[PDB]
Amino acid sequence: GSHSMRYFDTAMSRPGRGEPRFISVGYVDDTQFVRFDSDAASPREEPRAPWIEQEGPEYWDRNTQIFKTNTQTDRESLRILLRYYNQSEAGSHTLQSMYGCDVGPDGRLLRGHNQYAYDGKDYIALNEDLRSWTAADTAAQITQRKWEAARVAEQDRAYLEGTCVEWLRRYLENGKDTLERADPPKTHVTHHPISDHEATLRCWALGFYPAEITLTWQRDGEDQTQDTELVETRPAGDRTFQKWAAVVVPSGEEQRYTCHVQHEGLPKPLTLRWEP
C-alpha cells in the first residue's frame, strides 16, 4: 500500500537547567525506528524495528553528525525566537518540527512535509508545492525572507524528493515482514443499559496496524456521526492500535444499528451488529 516516513523533532529550553534538550524520533508509518536524544551519547534502535540494525557504521556516523548539527541549529533558533517574540531569557520554550515524505505503492513521492511550530503554534511550513512557505505571523515572515534569500526550499525539496524517498524504499524492503503487513482489526459490539429506556452500543476494533481506521455507526443505514462518541485511537504497546465508537440507542432498537469498519487490513469494509 501507501507509506510515510516522518521525523518528529522537539527542542525545549529550560533556563537554569542546562542547554535545551533536543529529541529527533523517526517513524515509518506508525512504527518508531530510531530515536536521537541530546541527553544520550548514541541513538536508540527500536526492538520492534530490528530491520534498522543492518545499517552499519557509515549510516550511524552520518546520522549522529546530522543530529549534532541539528541540535546546534535548533538551540540557536531558540535564542533568536526570544528576540522575534520580544521574550525574556527566564521562560521555557519549545521549538518543534515534523518533516518527511509520503510514497505510493510504487515508492514514488506522493507528498513532502516540513513544518515548524514555536510554543505549540504553527510557525513556518513548506507548502505542498515544495517551493513556497506559509509564515504564520510577522516573526515567521523574517524566517521566510532569510530562507528565500538562502534558497532553503530547494535544499529541503532535494531531501524530500531524494534521500527521504530512497531511504523509505530501503527501510520498507529491509522491514518488509512488518512494515508491509497490515493487521486487520478484530471487532465486536458490546451493550450496556444506561437506563430502563436507553442503552450504549460500543463498537470495538483491536489489534490493528496501521493506526488509520474508520469506525462509524449507522441507524437504518444513515450515518450517526453527530451522535457517535469516538475515542482517540490508542496504542496497545505491541505495535497495534485500539479504538471504539459508541452510540446511545432507545432500548429495543439495537438491531436498527450497524457498525461500519474500514481499515487497510480488510479486503472490504465490515458491517457488524450487537449479537445478544
Binding site: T73, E76, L95, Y116, W147, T163, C164, W167
Partner: peptide
C-alpha cells in the same frame, strides 16, 4: 535517514 537543518530560523 535524517535531514540536516539548511539554516536556522
Amino acid at each position: 535517514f535524517l535531514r540536516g537543518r539548511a539554516y536556522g530560523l
